[PDB]
Amino acid sequence: PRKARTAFSDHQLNQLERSFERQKYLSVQDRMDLAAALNLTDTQVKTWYQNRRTKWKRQTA
Template sequence: APVRLPEKAAGPRGGGSAPASPLCALQELTSKTFRGLELGVLQAAEGRDPPGGAPGPRPPCKKRRKSRTAFTAQQLRELEARFRRQKYLSPADRDALAARLALGTGQVITWFQNRRAKLKRDLEELRADVASLRALPPAALRQLAAMPDPPPP
């Protein structure tokens, strides 16, 4: 049944028990609901019955989230190589790549979205590094330039 909100809400210091706005009413309702749930969960964990005797009808279970894809090294090499050449795939290219790598099209779509987001983050970090270097005085820049390169890993 839909929740009915009070038609006249009392002001913040109006003295009435009605919430100040529909948003406040919603917050009050959810906080009471969650407080009740928390209490029931705690009591169930302790082996006691939740308040009100037996638990009421349980809400339908949420759909389980799909597990994280573990790409093989070969799949990652091919995905990275394709990404270097082409940041966005046409549906035909995407389907062909997915079939060749034995992946679902959704996995290829998600991988490319995540890889573009990573590229964007990396570029923003690089821009910030360059900006901070530009802010250094010339003497500090010369000192940095004179430093030896670190050994390769």
């Protein structure tokens, strides 16, 4: 079974985008800290970072 697609809250997307604008990569500890602060799993944040770096490369052209 695929895992169900996460629907991020406004709060979670806002903080994820702010984190990404500051740092394109996070250390393990920063990734875990951000996940905890946003009530997300480590994997949800890791996955969001990774997909966000894909978008960042597309838009940098």
